[PDB]
């Protein structure tokens, strides 16, 4: 019950997810999810890819998938599952943004606070530069 405004989007070559708080996605070999204002990281080069026209999934340079759990929180999986899927849809026109499949109904994006740490689905929601990503070349 969305619109299907989609973006170009590649899933051919990895990319760095920037948030418009000037956060980069990373995703630790733990599993542990954050933003960091290292452009040099070595935990920030994802890959993406497409499962559906609009659904993706977000892949680890180790092999770990972003997750959301029941609760709202982000975690990096070993194997794919239902909460790994992810619609993929533009935003402003220009951005990219990314809401949880199985929890579309309720608005559940991804997003960075300006401190670097992870929002929860319930505290995200349209208008917060928090949800605004662009992929960038590595």
């Known amino acids: 019950h969305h619109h299907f405004n989609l973006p170009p989007g590649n899933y051919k070559?990895?990319?760095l997810l920037?948030?418009?708080?000037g956060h980069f996605l990373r995703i630790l070999p733990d599993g542990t999810v954050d933003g960091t204002r290292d452009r040099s990281d070595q935990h920030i080069?994802?890959?993406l890819s497409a499962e559906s026209v609009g659904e993706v999934y977000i892949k680890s340079t180790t092999?770990?998938?972003?997750?959301?759990d029941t609760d709202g929180l982000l975690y990096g999986s070993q194997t794919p599952n239902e909460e790994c899927l992810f619609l993929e849809r533009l935003?402003?026109?220009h951005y990219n943004t990314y809401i949880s499949k199985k929890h579309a109904e309720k608005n559940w994006f991804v997003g960075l606070k300006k401190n670097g740490s992870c929002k929860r689905g319930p505290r995200?929601?349209?208008?917060?530069?928090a949800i605004?990503?662009?992929?960038?070349?590595?």
Do not use: D, R
Not at 124 to 129: A, D, N, V
């Open 13 to 15: 070559k990895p990319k």
């Open 18 to 21: 920037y948030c418009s708080n």
């Open 45 to 47: 080069q994802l890959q």
């Open 63 to 68: 092999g770990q998938y972003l997750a959301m």
């Open 91 to 93: 935003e402003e026109n």
């Open 124 to 129: 995200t929601h349209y208008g917060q530069k």
């Open 132 to 138: 605004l990503f662009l992929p960038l070349p590595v």
